[PDB]
RNA sequence: UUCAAAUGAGAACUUUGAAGACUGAAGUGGGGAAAGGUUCCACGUCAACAGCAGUUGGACGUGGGUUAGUCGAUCCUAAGAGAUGGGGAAGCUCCGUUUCAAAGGCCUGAUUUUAUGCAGGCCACCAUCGAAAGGGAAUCCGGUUAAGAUUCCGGAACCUGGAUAUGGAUUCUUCACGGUAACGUAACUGAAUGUGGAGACGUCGGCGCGAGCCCUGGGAGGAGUUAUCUUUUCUUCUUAACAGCUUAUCACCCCGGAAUUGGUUUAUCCGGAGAUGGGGUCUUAUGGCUGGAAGAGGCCAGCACCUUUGCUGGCUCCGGUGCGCUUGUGACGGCCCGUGAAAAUCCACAGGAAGGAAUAGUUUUCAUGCCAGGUCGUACUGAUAACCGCAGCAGGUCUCCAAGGUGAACAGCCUCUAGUUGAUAGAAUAAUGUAGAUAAGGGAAGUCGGCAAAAUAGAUCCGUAACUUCGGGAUAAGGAUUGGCUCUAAGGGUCGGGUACGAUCAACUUAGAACUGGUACGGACAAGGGGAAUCUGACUGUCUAAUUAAAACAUAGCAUUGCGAUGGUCAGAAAGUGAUGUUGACGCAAU
RNA sequence: AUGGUGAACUAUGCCUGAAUAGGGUGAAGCCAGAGGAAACUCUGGUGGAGGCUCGUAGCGGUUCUGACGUGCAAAUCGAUC
């Protein structure tokens, strides 16, 4: 890093949008079943493997 | 006491990464990157730095009035003049001897 | 205050001396000075005629 | 067992020549019209060091007679040849050190180097720091010429085959003790990866015909047949005699 | 004042390699570093530069020569043999 | 980036087609050793270089400032 | 580590002030490469997480933030990789990379149906990928942000492409003059084709000079100490790219003609192939003064007021020193069976096809002028918490910058600047520990074994054996000396001398002599135990990462073998296939 | 047994880069001088040689058969080297 390829900037940027908690309004829909976000990620817990 | 950092992302000490510490109007020390040095062009005959000709890294010779890249003589910016001297002398003399070689063996054929 | 006292030949005895004589002042450095100075004297006396060339040239090679 | 060392060198991986610094390949001029009906002049613009070579190369430039332009060849410098010198290449060319002549035209006794095997293979015989060949006779009908090589082996090649007058430079190179490991180190540095050499006797059986045992010993005869198969041939291959050479050498 | 009874330039090698070997080198080293007479301009300015190559300080001529010395004994006989043989061809 | 001294060449600069604006500068300085004196630099700005003409004489400056084209944009100090 | 304040339900742990310390410029400072990917910054904020805690965080929630013609990429080529005409292979695919190939595109001319067919002449180079440390067009300084900056703001530049118009230069001797010459210059035409240079190159050594740093005098400022003493201690006093003029060791030219040989480096080279001498010519590394540019920056004092925050004055000057340190660089010298890349790219010259003036032509390598410069990366960590080791792991992980003292020193030890003060805490100090020490008399009696420990140590002088490959053995061994202070002597630079000496300036070295002390003084730090033999390996060098470092491997040296290419040796399933081979017996291969 | 994936560790070659305080020794070459009938021999300097030596960084890994041995660590830590 520190001087990256646009391919990698993307995945990096895509991964930044996926790093939010559940939108709580979803919690309210009929039959809704998703308690929490089970696909979250931390920079110092799981590495992206590029 | 005042120390200093490279100004480019390259962190290693190479020929294209030479530094030069400098005092700015700000009163601070600062690195300045220094282009590699120019070397003098040379005689393609004797081999010396050929005098009268200016010296700058090659592409910089295209940003320069034509006089900086020449001297005003036969074979000007290209051979060292004592070289030109030589190849004039040898030219004359060998062209002359050519005459002495011809008419002499023009006699051989007639006296044989 | 100290450095001054140094200037007066102080604190320079065998006791306060940890590097060798050579390291403190390289033999060669001493030489090169001396010879540069003999050399430079000759050129003076000769550049004035105080001494002639034939004598100079002997001194040079002797120096 | 493991593939033994000498087998591995053929697949040429970490073995291949160290090529990079080398003036180019040394060669005679192509065998054109000029050089086989007359002769042609050029100047040695430079004699220089080839890397991994014993003998100095010789940059020698000529005119191209079929286009206005210079064409430079690369010669191995015979002894005593010098920059600025004129060099002659051709059947009808005078016989002084440095010139290249067909072996048909040199009186016997002539000493020559970098000689062609077939004519026009641009040099191929005695090119090494010191060596040369001696023309020991001619046979006009079926124009052959007989020469002695540096090996002492006598050979007969065609007379049109060229070779150059004189001996190769760098004489006596092998006379100086290498002296230490580093010198050979730097010797082979610019040749190929063949040094240092472990002894097959110091390895285990997996590694070599000689390997293993509770003492270091070849354990069977080290003179190995010609017909011997890959992975067997290590030691004195095809050895017809063996032991310290008593008495004079020199091919009778 | 004489510094070494015998080892000469070979005195760099200290105690190593064995006397005999130092001798063989020394002989050849004295040959290679030595300064030589120029056939062309006549000053003793020919000095070596990598095995085989001999070049004049001034006048800048370069001769190809022996590995450690300028003229191989061999080569020089060869110079003469060719002399001889050449001569026959004109006369 | 360029210095000028010809007080005729100067004038013509200030009438060049591309020379839009210019500025006049005033430093107190000192003379030889004894005393001070008022210096004045006449900077003209071309499309690719700032020519500046130092006039060390107070008198010459007062007359020069009037020679300036009235269509020129002068920045005083 | 400590005291206090503030904050908060709550404070050993957060913020702030104070105190004590630490890292000590080979950093716990300032930045980067790889790797991470938002951790960067702000606000909110503690359920989990940070092996005590928590009001704090690299955690949680929510947002904000990475600006380029000039920095990189992009282009170039390196080892190598790899399509294609081919040839192998049942086939996936293997070979080959210019090789058994009909391999392709530039300049302007021919058009004035017209847009671009043919007319010359070339040129045979025949993919492409491969470097964010190699090659390479061009930018700096000041200011600015919560967080960006050689990227924004401000000022000043430069490069490349494209357009071109005025000025100048040039020509009736058409394609300039000048200089004896080296060569000068604001210019001063030049197709094909050829040729030359630059790109472009090892390492060590001393010596010369540059820059930054270090040291230091005077003056102008601000600060510190002042029982006492000190014209004191500390600190500010700066000048970018770019441009003009000027500046060089080297090299070369002109004059002249050398034994009584001279010139000359620290280092012994130079000259009748023209020295010493005199006079000139060039390279512009580097430096000087001016432009930039004092308006900036830096230091102060003197007025204003919730504010944005101003407003007004000043000063920013002159020098010294050198085996200093770091780096840059030149002229040289040593070394080699080692002689220490390539291409893109830029210029020059040889050539002279051609085009071009007097009623007006040629000229854009002189000046000035106009338009344009895309795409992607730009945050931050770089480590005793941002990377890899299951982790905020005593491990690992490529590099630049570098102050004062002591000392030989980039050592150790103390300090300035900057940064830390993180590592659960409290009370006691039993046994046994781990780590650090001392011990009367004896001195290895301990033990497999002096294991461990002790002893030694710097520097100056004196003194030094067998043996030896004559180079060593050697710091052999053995000795003496060493502080403080006070003096003496030796060692240098710069100037004017008709064609003997005078005058001043600035240095630590080295030897000596007094006095002095609870006989101490390399006073901490730092720093070799020696000796006589046997065995074994010659030596330096190498290995079992994680129980073996050795006498084992290597080595030079010695010797033996194979081979002249239709070949030795070795690779492959094959082959119009491959290593040795850019090779040739002073060689390659095999012991 | 068949078919696949690895040289981010490590082994070795190539290509292109980068890195190493201060000391001791004093090899060729060079200058001046001394003796000697001669042949030749000596002294003082200068100079800076080496897979040389003292020793940091670096690289390594000898001993304590030291620490640790449910570790900081699936190889580390200390001193010594
Ligand atoms: Mg940066
Ligand atoms: Mg280097
Ligand atoms: Mg680069
Ligand atoms: Mg010129
Ligand atoms: Mg010039
Ligand atoms: Mg000396
Ligand atoms: Mg002097
Ligand atoms: Mg002399
Ligand atoms: Mg190859
Ligand atoms: Mg090897
Ligand atoms: Mg071996
Ligand atoms: Mg062997
Ligand atoms: Mg074994
Ligand atoms: Mg077997
Ligand atoms: Mg067998
Ligand atoms: Mg065996
Ligand atoms: Mg045996
Ligand atoms: Mg605490
Ligand atoms: Mg606090
Ligand atoms: Mg401290
Ligand atoms: Mg240190
Ligand atoms: Mg820390
Ligand atoms: Mg990270
Ligand atoms: Mg975020
Ligand atoms: Mg933060
Ligand atoms: Mg809680
Ligand atoms: Mg955590
Ligand atoms: Mg906790
Ligand atoms: Mg808790
Ligand atoms: Mg967040
Ligand atoms: Mg650039
Ligand atoms: Mg691009
Ligand atoms: Mg292929
Ligand atoms: Mg490419
Ligand atoms: Mg690059
Ligand atoms: Mg800034
Ligand atoms: Mg912003
Ligand atoms: Mg920043
Ligand atoms: Mg701007
Ligand atoms: Mg502007
Ligand atoms: Mg342009
Ligand atoms: Mg003119
Ligand atoms: Mg070319
Ligand atoms: Mg070239
Ligand atoms: Mg290079
Ligand atoms: Mg200061
Ligand atoms: Mg610049
Ligand atoms: Mg002169
Ligand atoms: Mg003159
Ligand atoms: Mg000196
Ligand atoms: Mg450095
Ligand atoms: Mg060389
Ligand atoms: Mg050029
Ligand atoms: Mg122009
Ligand atoms: Mg385009
Ligand atoms: Mg940044
Ligand atoms: Mg950073
Ligand atoms: Mg951190
Ligand atoms: Mg991690
Ligand atoms: Mg993981
Ligand atoms: Mg860790
Ligand atoms: Mg930090
Ligand atoms: Mg702990
Ligand atoms: Mg406790
Ligand atoms: Mg006791
Ligand atoms: Mg006793
Ligand atoms: Mg006893
Ligand atoms: Mg006992
Ligand atoms: Mg025992
Ligand atoms: Mg016993
Ligand atoms: Mg012990
Ligand atoms: Mg004791
Ligand atoms: Mg012995
Ligand atoms: Mg002994
Ligand atoms: Mg005393
Ligand atoms: Mg005195
Ligand atoms: Mg005096
Ligand atoms: Mg050994
Ligand atoms: Mg092991
Ligand atoms: Mg194992
Ligand atoms: Mg060992
Ligand atoms: Mg071990
Ligand atoms: Mg033997
Ligand atoms: Mg076939
Ligand atoms: Mg690797
Ligand atoms: Mg060193
Ligand atoms: Mg020492
Ligand atoms: Mg050393
Ligand atoms: Mg006498
Ligand atoms: Mg040395
Ligand atoms: Mg060594
Ligand atoms: Mg050692
Ligand atoms: Mg030491
Ligand atoms: Mg270590
Ligand atoms: Mg090692
Ligand atoms: Mg250990
Ligand atoms: Mg243990
Ligand atoms: Mg335990
Ligand atoms: Mg050590
Ligand atoms: Zn010569």
């Amino acid at each position: 890093a520190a001087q990256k390829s646009f391919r990698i900037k993307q995945k990096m940027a895509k991964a930044k949008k996926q790093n939010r908690p559940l939108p709580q309004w979803i919690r309210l829909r009929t039959n809704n079943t998703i308690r929490y976000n089970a696909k979250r990620r931390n920079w110092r817990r799981t590495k992206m493997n590029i | 006491a005042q120390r200093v950092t490279f100004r480019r992302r390259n962190p290693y000490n190479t020929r294209s990464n030479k530094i030069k510490v400098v005092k700015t109007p700000g009163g601070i020390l600062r690195a300045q990157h220094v282009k590699k040095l120019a070397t003098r062009p040379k005689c393609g005959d004797c081999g010396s730095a050929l005098q009268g000709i200016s010296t700058l890294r090659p592409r910089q010779y295209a940003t320069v009035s034509k006089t900086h890249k020449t001297v005003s003589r036969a074979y000007g910016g290209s051979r060292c003049a004592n070289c030109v001297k030589e190849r004039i002398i040898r030219a004359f003399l060998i062209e002359e001897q050519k005459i002495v070689k011809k008419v002499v063996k023009e006699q051989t054929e007639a006296a044989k | 205050a100290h450095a001054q006292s140094k200037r007066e030949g102080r604190h320079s005895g065998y006791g306060k001396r940890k590097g060798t004589r050579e390291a403190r002042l390289p033999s060669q450095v001493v030489w090169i000075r001396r010879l540069r100075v003999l050399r430079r004297l000759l050129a003076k006396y000769r550049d004035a005629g105080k001494i002639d060339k034939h004598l100079y040239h002997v001194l040079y090679k002797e120096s | 067992g493991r593939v033994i060392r000498n087998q591995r060198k053929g697949a040429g991986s970490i073995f291949t020549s160290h090529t990079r610094l080398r003036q180019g390949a040394a060669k005679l001029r192509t065998l054109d019209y000029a050089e086989r009906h007359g002769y042609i002049r050029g100047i040695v613009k430079q004699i220089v060091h080839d890397s991994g070579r014993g003998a100095p190369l010789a940059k020698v430039v000529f005119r191209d007679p079929y286009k206005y332009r210079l064409r430079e060849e690369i010669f191995i410098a015979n002894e005593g040849v010098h920059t600025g010198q004129f060099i002659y290449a051709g059947k009808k060319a005078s016989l002084n050190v440095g010139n290249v002549l067909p072996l048909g035209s040199v009186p016997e006794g002539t000493i020559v180097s970098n000689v062609e095997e077939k004519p026009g293979d641009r040099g191929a015989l005695a090119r090494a720091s010191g060596n040369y060949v001696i023309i020991i006779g001619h046979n006009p009908d079926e124009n052959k010429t007989r020469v002695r090589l540096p090996s002492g082996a006598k050979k007969v090649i065609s007379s049109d085959a060229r070779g150059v007058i004189g001996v190769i430079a760098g004489g006596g190179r092998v006379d100086k003790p290498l002296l230490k490991a580093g010198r050979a180190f730097h010797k082979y540095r610019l040749k190929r990866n063949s040094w240092p050499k472990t002894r097959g006797v110091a390895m285990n059986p997996v590694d070599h015909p000689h390997g293993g045992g509770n003492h270091q010993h070849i354990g069977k005869a080290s003179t190995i047949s010609r017909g011997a198969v890959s992975g067997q041939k290590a030691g004195l291959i095809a050895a017809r005699r063996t032991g310290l050479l008593r008495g004079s050498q020199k091919t009778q | 004042a004489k510094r070494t009874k015998k080892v000469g330039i070979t005195g760099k090698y200290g105690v190593r390699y064995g006397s005999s070997l130092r001798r063989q080198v020394k002989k050849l080293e004295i040959q290679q570093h030595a300064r030589y007479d120029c056939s062309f301009c006549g000053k003793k300015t020919v000095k070596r530069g990598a095995a085989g190559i001999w070049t004049c300080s001034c006048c800048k001529k370069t001769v190809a020569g022996g590995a450690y010395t300028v003229s191989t004994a061999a080569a020089a006989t060869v110079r003469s043999t060719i002399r001889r043989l050449r001569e026959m061809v004109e006369a | 980036a360029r210095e000028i001294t010809d007080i005729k060449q100067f004038l013509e600069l200030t009438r060049r087609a591309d020379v839009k604006t210019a500025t006049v500068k005033i430093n107190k300085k000192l003379n030889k050793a004894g005393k001070p004196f008022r210096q004045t630099k006449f900077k003209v700005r071309g499309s690719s270089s700032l020519y500046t003409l130092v006039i060390n004489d107070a008198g010459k400056a007062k007359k020069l400032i009037q020679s300036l084209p009235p269509t020129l944009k002068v920045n005083r100090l």
Side-chain angles (χ1 to χ4, degrees), chain A, chain B, chain C, chain D residues 1-251, chain E, chain F:
Chain A
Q3 188 128 276
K4 352 156 173 279
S5 51
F6 177 77
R7 183 185 305 272
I8 291 303
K9 203 199 218 194
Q10 263 167 346
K11 323 211 62 173
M12 274 201 273
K14 175 178 183 56
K16 182 213 191 164
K17 329 204 202 165
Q18 295 168 324
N19 190 26
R20 49 108 84 240
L22 223 262
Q24 301 306 300
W25 68 256
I26 284 154
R27 279 235 229 197
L28 262 7
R29 310 157 325 167
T30 303
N31 316 321
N32 170 61
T33 167
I34 306 171
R35 324 187 61 72
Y36 71 89
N37 180 5
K39 265 160 163 261
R40 199 80 173 280
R41 174 188 65 82
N42 183 260
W43 74 261
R44 206 163 49 176
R45 301 202 310 266
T46 287
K47 259 65 188 51
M48 296 210 289
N49 297 339
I50 278 225
Chain B
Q2 199 153 108
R3 289 170 277 195
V4 122
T5 65
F6 278 135
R7 271 143 98 17
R8 295 150 185 194
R9 284 187 156 282
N10 183 18
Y12 305 118
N13 183 25
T14 76
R15 258 202 290 105
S16 65
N17 206 6
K18 301 195 261 109
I19 234 48
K20 165 214 186 192
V21 181
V22 143
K23 227 128 123 72
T24 70
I28 60 221
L29 271 200
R30 181 168 302 154
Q32 211 148 82
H33 289 266
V34 170
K35 296 144 151 158
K36 271 181 278 152
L37 250 61
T39 81
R40 291 179 69 162
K42 326 265 182 41
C43 181
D45 263 342
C46 74
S48 313
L50 81 180
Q51 122 188 208
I53 314 291
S54 303
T55 126
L56 7 128
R57 238 69 184 40
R59 214 248 188 96
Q60 288 312 297
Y61 282 116
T63 73
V64 130
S65 159
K66 194 161 169 274
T67 48
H68 307 72
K69 309 181 280 166
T70 342
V71 306
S72 281
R73 188 210 319 113
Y75 279 98
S78 232
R79 321 282 158 134
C80 88
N82 285 11
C83 277
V84 169
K85 222 288 276 299
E86 238 204 15
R87 67 157 79 196
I88 302 180
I89 300 302
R90 182 189 292 97
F92 172 68
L93 294 186
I94 294 203
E95 280 302 335
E96 273 280 281
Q97 278 292 337
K98 250 174 278 198
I99 265 71
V100 201
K101 268 49 161 41
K102 298 341 172 330
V103 89
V104 145
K105 300 272 186 56
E106 272 185 352
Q107 285 181 329
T108 296
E109 304 179 344
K112 222 168 183 179
Chain C
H2 182 264
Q4 174 75 20
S5 66
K6 269 280 221 283
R7 299 166 172 286
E8 299 149 12
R10 227 111 291 180
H11 317 280
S12 295
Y14 300 118
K16 315 220 63 184
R17 264 140 90 159
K18 282 191 83 216
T20 68
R21 199 165 60 239
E22 238 317 84
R24 307 165 52 72
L25 182 27
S27 319
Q28 193 192 12
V29 177
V30 180
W31 165 260
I32 301 189
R33 284 161 169 182
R34 188 158 117 242
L35 210 211
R36 284 227 248 261
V37 148
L38 299 167
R39 217 106 113 183
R40 189 236 65 264
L41 185 160
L42 263 0
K44 182 156 21 199
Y45 279 8
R46 184 250 284 190
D47 262 15
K50 268 201 67 167
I51 232 181
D52 76 72
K53 65 171 174 159
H54 301 285
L55 177 53
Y56 161 86
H57 196 87
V58 166
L59 297 180
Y60 191 107
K61 284 202 79 73
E62 255 147 55
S63 302
Chain D
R2 190 186 295 280
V3 181
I4 68 179
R5 182 187 54 219
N6 58 50
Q7 308 188 259
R8 295 184 15 238
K9 313 181 113 164
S13 167
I14 43 109
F15 287 102
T16 87
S17 232
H18 296 26
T19 282
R20 172 187 65 120
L21 287 172
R22 286 146 86 133
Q23 297 299 333
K27 265 176 187 225
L28 298 192
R29 271 182 27 106
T30 300
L31 215 228
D32 78 302
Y33 193 85
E35 270 223 64
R36 54 187 173 74
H37 280 309
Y39 71 95
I40 162 189
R41 187 173 96 199
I43 16 70
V44 11
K45 224 90 179 171
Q46 199 167 341
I47 81 93
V48 14
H49 179 68
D50 187 37
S51 306
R53 184 180 295 270
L57 292 204
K59 303 276 182 63
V60 188
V61 0
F62 298 86
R63 255 160 89 257
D64 169 89
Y66 314 83
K67 189 182 182 173
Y68 160 93
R69 48 110 112 222
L70 269 24
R71 290 215 275 98
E72 129 172 323
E73 247 72 39
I74 304 181
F75 290 3
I76 330 165
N78 266 13
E79 188 144 326
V81 347
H82 66 91
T83 60
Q85 176 187 337
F86 279 133
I87 237 58
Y88 299 93
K91 196 196 52 167
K92 288 180 182 188
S94 100
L95 181 254
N96 339 279
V97 97
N99 289 359
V100 6
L101 276 47
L103 255 35
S105 307
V106 284
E108 47 217 24
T110 312
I111 286 179
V112 294
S113 81
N114 189 25
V115 347
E116 283 173 341
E117 235 154 15
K118 314 158 165 192
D121 67 15
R122 315 190 52 160
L125 281 174
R127 332 167 86 252
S129 180
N131 307 91
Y132 57 80
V133 327
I134 288 178
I135 277 87
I136 62 177
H138 315 269
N139 174 21
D141 317 6
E142 341 136 333
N143 60 338
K144 305 282 157 31
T145 284
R146 199 161 184 228
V147 294
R148 161 166 264 97
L149 295 169
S151 94
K154 323 186 261 248
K155 167 142 176 200
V156 42
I157 78 204
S158 152
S159 280
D160 311 318
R162 322 182 260 150
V164 354
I165 313 303
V167 309
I168 302 259
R173 210 171 31 71
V174 305
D175 286 346
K176 188 177 158 153
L178 236 14
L179 231 219
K180 22 186 209 146
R183 304 271 185 87
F185 172 90
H186 288 296
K187 190 189 186 173
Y188 292 99
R189 181 153 118 282
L190 296 112
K191 306 197 132 280
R192 50 210 91 73
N193 191 15
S194 53
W195 171 109
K197 310 209 171 51
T198 307
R199 291 167 284 129
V201 102
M203 12 230 264
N204 305 116
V206 259
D207 304 297
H208 198 274
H210 299 172
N214 287 345
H215 292 279
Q216 299 209 299
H217 69 111
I218 300 187
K220 273 171 166 299
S222 78
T223 45
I224 279 184
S225 149
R226 260 271 137 66
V229 113
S230 225
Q232 280 186 343
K233 272 180 193 178
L236 301 186
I237 289 163
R240 45 195 109 196
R241 68 101 46 191
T242 165
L244 163 47
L245 288 186
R246 294 294 208 297
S248 154
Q249 293 307 118
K250 272 65 164 325
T251 163
Chain E
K2 175 176 73 179
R3 294 177 223 123
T4 7
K5 166 163 164 183
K6 61 188 48 185
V7 309
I9 203 193
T10 234
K12 36 199 174 162
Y13 304 135
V15 138
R16 300 174 254 135
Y17 319 118
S19 67
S20 287
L21 284 205
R22 282 186 261 95
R23 279 208 319 293
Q24 237 326 283
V25 165
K26 157 137 180 272
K27 162 175 138 81
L28 281 178
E29 267 204 54
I30 289 154
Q31 299 192 6
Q32 49 165 118
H33 299 143
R35 220 177 182 256
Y36 283 63
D37 286 339
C38 189
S39 296
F40 294 100
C41 74
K43 300 176 186 181
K44 61 172 320 90
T45 49
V46 185
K47 224 170 179 294
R48 202 251 250 165
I53 310 195
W54 306 82
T55 87
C56 199
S57 266
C58 78
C59 99
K60 316 298 177 182
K61 280 253 192 307
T62 288
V63 181
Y68 305 110
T69 224
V70 174
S71 196
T72 339
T77 89
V78 189
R79 204 182 339 266
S80 98
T81 294
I82 292 305
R83 257 278 284 165
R84 173 189 87 77
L85 280 158
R86 182 145 83 270
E87 318 275 72
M88 298 185 69
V89 166
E90 16 279 42
Chain F
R2 221 166 244 106
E3 160 131 47
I4 246 112
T5 16
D6 183 24
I7 326 91
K8 173 63 138 54
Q9 177 198 29
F10 172 61
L11 264 213
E12 303 167 335
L13 261 187
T14 52
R15 286 170 295 182
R16 195 151 99 202
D18 75 273
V19 169
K20 271 247 277 183
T21 126
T23 75
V24 133
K25 178 55 174 43
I26 305 291
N27 330 314
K28 167 252 186 177
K29 285 187 174 306
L30 92 162
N31 51 250
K32 277 306 190 178
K35 249 192 184 173
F37 85 105
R38 197 159 154 276
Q39 197 192 64
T40 154
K41 289 187 191 159
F42 281 77
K43 311 175 167 228
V44 277
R45 172 106 271 286
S47 297
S48 53
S49 41
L50 184 69
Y51 317 94
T52 139
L53 151 129
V54 192
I55 295 312
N56 261 323
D57 166 84
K60 274 246 85 166
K62 172 148 189 160
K63 289 334 292 122
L64 228 183
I65 304 193
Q66 227 301 70
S67 279
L68 274 299
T71 35
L72 188 95
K73 290 190 190 193
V74 171
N75 184 5
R76 221 90 156 238
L77 270 299

